[model samples]
Target chain A: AKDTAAGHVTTPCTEILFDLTLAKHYENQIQAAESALNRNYAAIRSWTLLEAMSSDGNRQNAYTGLIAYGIQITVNAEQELQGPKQTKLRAAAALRHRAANLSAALQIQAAQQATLTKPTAGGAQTPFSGATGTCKYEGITATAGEQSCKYSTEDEEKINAAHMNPEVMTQITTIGDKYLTTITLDAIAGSKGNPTQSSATYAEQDCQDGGNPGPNFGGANALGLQVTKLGTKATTEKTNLYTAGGTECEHQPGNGPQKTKQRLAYLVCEANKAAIITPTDLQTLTLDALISAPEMAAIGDALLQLLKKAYGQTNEQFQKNFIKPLAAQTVKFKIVSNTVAALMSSPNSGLALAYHK
Target chain B: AKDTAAGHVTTPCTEILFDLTLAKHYENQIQAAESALNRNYAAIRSWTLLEAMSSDGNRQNAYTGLIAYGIQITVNAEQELQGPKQTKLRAAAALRHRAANLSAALQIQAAQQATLTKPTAGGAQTPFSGATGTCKYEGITATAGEQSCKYSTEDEEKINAAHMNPEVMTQITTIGDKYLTTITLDAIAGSKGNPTQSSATYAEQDCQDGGNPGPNFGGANALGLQVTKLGTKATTEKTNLYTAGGTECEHQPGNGPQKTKQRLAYLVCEANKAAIITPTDLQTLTLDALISAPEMAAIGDALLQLLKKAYGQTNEQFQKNFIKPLAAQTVKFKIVSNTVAALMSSPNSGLALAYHK
Candidate 1:
């Protein structure tokens, strides 16, 4: 029995998804071997992701196996959305989008769950630094009782609001306001039908309807006149920028047009409600209107260029250094392409339901 | 130059916000050591997040340094929503929510970006079997012209639609439609102030106005009837079962509420606009509505519970002998709490801006 246990991988075993006890030994080996390589930052980054995704290969197999077994579970909510494949009014690739997103989301859940079940330093003492006191949690642990984990905090203050530098706050507010006005102006220009424009106003009215987030946050006078922007080309500059950013973010290795559809769905959902939008909100408004989100760094990169220019002058150094300045990373498309082509395929299984650029 | 580069930690470099080239070495070490520790899965999840956040930490430092430098970018979008920071009407701890969400997003982006720029395996031809094809990427190599490195497209197809598992598709659709109905019914219950309900109908009517996700999407008719549900009561037997599965998939150790808020913001932004929503879109027009999404696996697990029962009776799986049944995981909260406390704090610095349950 002991000898058999030692050679479990060699023996027949139940197939599972992602990283389970069965796959962890392999994962453990890979993690150690990769770390020993002394790869450069770029190389390390790639390895980190690959390590992170190692379990996913198992997850894919699990999903395939699960489907083959006729074992359906409600927890895989996205899968349930399939409601039997019918004819498509939307693009052909849309459904596949759900599957891929499902793949990512599921893998994330698996990885996190694996962690929630164990510690980082092997057991007793805490590893990093914060949340040091027993029964002290700074509000970022899993829900109490998850994995029997009872986290702390009824007395903790969310923020130390008193130290804010007012002058810095003012400047930050100005930058945000100016950007909002610019983006809104851009979006409004492209709102061809007067109705679309009127729709925006109604949204503003709803904004007044407790639209601005509040303590209770609803059913009353909330949303004031100011627009937070970030959705609906309800302007042109907004439209143009959306196109550029959307395309970039939309088509990463395994994700593509169907992913685009998910994005458009959110935006259109918002536009239809005349509901106030959030940062990064974008809607397609029509079938002909296409929208996608570029990576976060895309817009963040654009914002930083101007910020970097002003950093020399704004005196914001006294404020808060919260956001990072990153140049949009440039990757050799051929490398990323080959990498994707190779990483995404399975020798026997081909690709899961997914989309193309 | 070599001495300065090697001794960077000793000399205070001009503080830049977020992670940059300067932080990579530290990042590399942290990632390696964390994995080496058999601390359990929670620690790794936290570590994974921390690595992703290496860039953000720099961003924060940059923000701090930029403030020191008097640099101001376009005002923050969040700050703009508030004309002036007022008393908390939107609930007291929301700012903390931002910090926590920021923690999660920063980490996720970090992990993803690392992959975007390089390869996980050291220079080689291929590591896995899936992506094994001729003219394929086997090893890590770069220094290619990003723009000129145009890759091929001939082998890609998002999905092979011909293999339609018609019956499987129907079950999926049923679950989605059912989930949608359950959530919508719940949301509508809270929709008092007939006006809110009326508004929802209007949004839906407008959703129909241009909602079909017509290639263009949003104008008026898009948000009609369909509910884009992705948040929480944050939940529903249906809800009860959902919660049990939800927590495991809900929050990563290093990330929590703020992450949820970001997700809600997206959903609400769409709901607010009555924009065509997707993946999961649910809106409420009465008494101001609210939402938060469980991880995709939350609902998925719920579905699987029942599915598991049926598969027991199914005849298909007896032949393949696949499928590993798993009990929901369990862990000590004391372990998790202590883990959270230690991880978020710094001997010199404290917890990064973040939130909890």
Candidate 2:
């Protein structure tokens, strides 16, 4: 048995996981000792160099594995809150706006054609002339009141009708939040019921005849606000809105219509309460948002604090040395889940490895 | 310079920590590569074999270092709760009880001498025997109301005197709680102000003449209970009382006199509320208490749960696999702190290593 054991070699490689051993061996007790040494060396090397990136290879080092593990735990927790599916809403809004604008444009074209084709000899000064006043909306609420020729232009009536349209009203309500609704945004921009003569329809009308109302209010361009869903606008400025050291918007209720950035910050922040772990708190996230979130840093901070307490260094020293470095590390790693059969078979099963980036 | 740089080796070790490297090297780039391999090997070996025990040597492995670090953090947290210094109380009680017994013994001896020296005249049917009524204290409260020569034996009067003594009362109140105090303990044992002729002095009296009151009440052995400070009794059962899967005490106020084991559990449990982390929550701890506390296991469990979340494995799987093993590990390691200078100079500075247990 001793002779057989001495002659026996284990596995595919004589060396271990990450070791580079020289060609030297004794086929006896000395062989076992050398193998053990090589094995341990490989283990430490794996931790230090980390794992191969997915493109390069597949294997997880301790660092990548741990990060992936933390992400999943945090993501699962955040998923429970059921925050609005921002992507779906954005897609829906885009389609709705396109249809609304196309319909409004055709109607305006038809109205203009009818007016030009009409016999207008009365309007010219040929010993006889007929006077015509611009049509106006009776009331200035979200609901449509009677239309009249008492005081306003044709464009003003269409703008009023747009605001009072059932489809537009439903869209406003569906968006929720007073500051984010289309009606409220139009009101703040002075584009709801008031329009210019050159703008014959809601789609044709524009705002910003005067300067912007205020920083807290919506932008003066009504056309831009009308097409861009609040979620889409917020997503574009996600970094500035939700990240820790970015521009924060104060989104208190009963306030004036807010910039989309401010409204997005409010929704995300409130939903975050339900999300105990904040790294992936948003219902839908861009790759940048996933990695660059303040919550990612917070999670890193918590783990780093544990290491400081359980490894070395005080709170201040740990924060100074590792917090930012670890936070920066979030962008470098990615979670790699495996099929159950593969997971059971792989060397570093159930662990995620870092990308080469 | 190249030759010198190539020749350079690290520190005192020809081999690395926990490593037995064979003498081999290469002179240029190969030399650097070999050295790097050896260094990483040493690191992994250090983690695997752990550090030499303090008595054996001074060094730390990764596991021991982390355990030590966690212990210090947990102990510090628990120290915030000002639970009674049980050791100090035990020592104080031991001295006080010894002094009280010695003084009482002398007093009883003197009284017996006086009785024997005096001529007897009374009711033993010999017309020469002595008879006396035991003095009893009025009111069954904690206070000494009034003393009277009530219908009781001489030993019974002395027992009552012992219970009502200012020194005795002070000790009882100092111990705190109705069940833990000496007065209450005596009442439950049925030995307070109720003695027999065979016991001429309070010290000579015995209890359990019939049977015990109940499991919740004090033990029937008056002498044993009198000498043992409740803390000392509890300490003896410390494993059974405070450890998980051990005897637990229900210490409710207004309850009957509790067994010393029960009383200790109650105090520890209540104090644990203030002690958020409980490994070393007691004001004073014996070495055993420090090592074998349920709180140690609890801390381990909490950290292990994080690892399960942040490493691999689901909740149930982790609990089934690691919980007991980690809890059992509490007794295997210890903390080793260094002075500022030693710490700065040490290789594994600020880390503690496990013993070769």
Candidate 3:
């Protein structure tokens, strides 16, 4: 048999190919991916004769064929890798293209439906065409179309299942082993056309030099530079340095991305089920959740401030200087209305930048 | 001369006739004709020779005329005898004739003046006209028109001056006395058909009827037939009817009408000068005026009952039966428009009525 570790050798290549294929299959059809992968990979020591023969290349021609297959597997893995990479690139290029398309279609549908089925003035089923869109989905489309992607039911279900399983439902149980391992491997393995140590360097540079980042660091200052440090207090402290006087800092105190994530977690814990989180659920979150989560604490502070501003201060100055201006800007920067300058600008621009600046 | 008690008949028939004329003049215009009548009567009384030369038929006619005049003077002196009566038939007929002639002349003059003067909606100088023709003899017309009468200023001043003179004024006072004496003699001496009496059948009828009565007899039954029969006793006895059901009841241990009235008085006194009666002026009235005045106690009971019905009663029967019906009638009758009715019928109609209606 050829040397197992050598670059020229290709022994039992099917296992690696299968692993990548399985990962891709799971990603594409995320609903069944996890269970299928778990079933296939569980107790991996036992193997059929075919699997053993495929792994052991003993004949002279077997080595050549295995190498060719290895090349083929690499190409296939490269192509598979391109799937997510291209998706991400497309997402970056036209951030809201798919979402915009879906939104436009929904808007037309809503308008047509509104014309045909005009609801009572203030009742449920009120048309989506007027000021406030009728349903939650339509409202989301109107608000988030510019920065969101359009997803088919199947695609959305797959993505949602993947996210829920890994990030929500499954609780990232094996983060140190499974999730971190996958992430590390993905970062180290590099993309197609570059498979050497230099490729790894390129990947690291691409990630660290602000190209492709993990989901959590997608909008971060530097890319995967600090990804390894995630889930640690040190990472949070380091990240806070970059957030000072930045757009992240200028976000509505508790409504910021990190705080919103914590708030969502608190809501999930309070509900104790996999369902849409609510503000009431957030209110009932445990003290541990509030104390342990920096984001939750930030959100609680923000909510408390908001309540104080709403009920405590009676003077006109407080409303004029803080509450009214903030509320007006938030309302004005709606996606559909062209009345406000904030709505016309890119996400990098707008009130977020204005406040930071 | 006529036979009289404690009197001398020295004057002749002609002189008495002249004296009768002077007396009639004094009776007609006692305020100013006193001195003139005195002088004229004295001169006539002194003309004994002329009086004797007159024919017996003329003297008898003059004597009858004097008697009629005397009767007229007596009737005029009784200011209280204003109502139409046939007992003083001759004097009443003469008075009517004189009043009719005066009214006719005054109406004619008024109508002529009205033609020359400006007319106004409130009133005009015109004679009062009925459905057919002018009727200026009404008391209202005479009293109202007296202010605007067109008597010469010089004549008014002369008459005023004549009355103002000490001698003339004394004679005027004597005229009044004479007329009063004549009226008293005529009424008491049975000269007129209805003789005056200190006690009459009507007075006897009122005294025998008995004043106090029961509820069935047009008096409050709780206090019994005789108001003065109420005795001072703490216990219930035959003579001491002091229980809740007692007829000649003493003070009972309950909120009776008396207590209610007292409470109302307290409230009224407490609210004195607070858009209501002032306490200082509360007692400045006779019992008759206090109880009988339309704007005072007569209406107080109804108003108090209305207040009780509005606020005290558990069942809204009073509001449903009385207040609502009255309000509806007022609205239907257009006593007040919808806007005004809205204000008038607010809260409880009884309370609204107590405040406004």
Candidate 4:
């Protein structure tokens, strides 16, 4: 019915894994800082001998005194300049923080990739075991009034055990489920009894095929964003998504379970995050973010305006015009971008993971 | 017959006009300022992730907090750093001051050179006129206790009028005779009742020759430095020294008066100082002066020592160890060099002239 989950679903999961917007935000911040620095230098240079000689009575001493005053005022302005300079430096730190986080993800991905065992060429898909075996909520009752689908006491253990695999669930715990998944999809009808379509779960019906599936297979239990897609049919579809190797129809060396586990583990590691984000890209992004920031623009504007009013003035006038105005100009940086704001609020985001890395 | 006045005499006069010591001093100051800027940067950079991660519970926030602290302290240290930076800037001003002084001297010299009339090939020296006429103290009486020799009313006018030439005596009034002449020589046996040997006068006997003459030609009224060489003979020698063409002997179109005037004017203008001291030379000299200053060295030592103790410290510790010590260490710059000291004290020196220029 007209790609009902079109806004959220993408064929390849890697589409959700990589982003450069934050790096670009940081890059703008650096540019903003640099502009402030240049303005400061220019303001200092503007106090030349021509301006100092406005009074010629005590010529030499007056000139010397004027020079001293210029330097004093400029040095005082340095404090005001610090507001922007600090912002730039912080942007740099943020960029470095992002890189380190990506590095941590990369490390885990490589380690897990090295330890993986390949599935056999041909065989029937065996019945999934452990947590995988119980994810099949095929006939479970998902009452609307209930918090979750009614699984057998024994099946509940399997469902609970699925989330406890530390190695495979590390990304969800660290980077958070938000960054791992492509988008927050719309909740399917009557899916409230099951958990949301996020990094924690996948489509059960879609898992029938080892190959990639578009959203809405067996009623839109696609890998996408949705807070609570609850129902018996919905719950069954969601549970089946995590059985590994996509389906119970194929069991080439326990196909579906291994495949599901592999998908989760690969998402958990930082391979995608680290791979595309190069050092050069981080630098560019940081500078881009700094330059684009409104706060830096405000700081630069205040300084240049202050310089115009103050550079040629006497020391007393400069203090009144420049220093006072500068003190009044407090530079409080705003959230860099909308995506950054959302990313920060999202649970198990890459930023949260990178913080540890 | 011995060369008793050898120490005071220099030919062509440029030897006394140019010096590089002060320029070197300014260069050193710049170096000192740069070193301080670097140390400040390093101290800020020292607060990396490793040190911030010392407290791992609130990991990311703690790390971010530590970075903010590091930047806050460094910005605070900027005030401390300003002490050296200001000194360096002042040194730059001083170098510019020195150059301007030299330039004033050059302008005057060039103007006077352009207006000078050449002496005739040969003629009998007519009696000197105005101040030049009565410098001869052939019969003036001298007493040891008296401030000056007993000149006739008319003769005193000649002696007093000699120094009143605005055009010729500008160097003496502006640069002060101390820098124009070579050195202070030993007093002649009986020149006490006359004025001191300096830029104000030249030897009367030495005036006979257009060619350069040695000191002590007429009892050491040579252009040299000696406070008082008193006696009637000394007074006669000193009075005859400024009679334009050097003496009343050869008056080839007022030869002695013109020659003496030329000497004084040339010294007054900055040609010698400007010609030898170049832009590159000024920069080098300024840096040299800065680095060599004991004050800058003291400042450098204090900052480095502060960095060692404070770079790795927590915010509180850094404030106590670094900022406090820096505040206590007041950077008072000493006089750059011996020559600079002498030049400063000397009357109408290049520095004095440049102050106006």
Point to the candidate with the largest lDDT: 4
Please write out the lDDT profile of model 1 over residues A1-357, one tens digit for every residue.
111211221101100111122123223333333333212111222222232233444332222221111111111211222221111212112222222222222222222110011101111112211111111111111111111112123111111112111111110000111111111100000001111111212222221122332222222322111111111111111111122434322222244443232343333222222211111111111111101222212222322233233222233431111111111221222203234212222110011101110
- TM-score of candidate 1 versus the correct structure, residues matched by position: 0.13
At residue A251, give the lDDT of candidate 3. 22
Clashes by residue pair, model 2: B134-B152
True contacts kept of 1: 0.00
Which candidate ranks first by TM-score, i.e. highest?
A: 4
Deviation in angstroms for A169 in model 3? 42
Structural similarity to truth (TM-score) of each candidate: 0.13, 0.16, 0.10, 0.19
Best by DockQ: 1
* CAPRI verdict (incorrect, acceptable, medium, high) for model 3: incorrect
Per-residue C-alpha lDDT of model 1 across residues B1-357, encoded as one tens digit per residue: 111211221111111111122123223333343333212222222332233233443322211211111101101211232221222112112222222222222222222110011101111122111111101111111111111111123211111112111111110000111111111100000011111111212321211122222211222211111111111111111111012332222212245443333432232222112211111111110111100222212222312223233222343441111111111111122203233214322220011111110
lDDT per residue for candidate 4 within A97-155, as digits (tens), equals 33333322222112111111111111111121100111111111111111112234543
Chain B structural similarity (TM-score) per candidate: 0.12, 0.22, 0.13, 0.24
Q: Give the least accurate 10-residue stretch of model 3 chain A, judged by summed lDDT.
A: A180-189
lDDT of 1: 0.19
Q: Model 2 off-target regions past 4 Å?
A: A1-69, A77-83, A86-91, A98-110, A113-307, A311-316, A319-357, B1-357
Q: Whose DockQ is higher: candidate 1's or candidate 2's?
A: 1
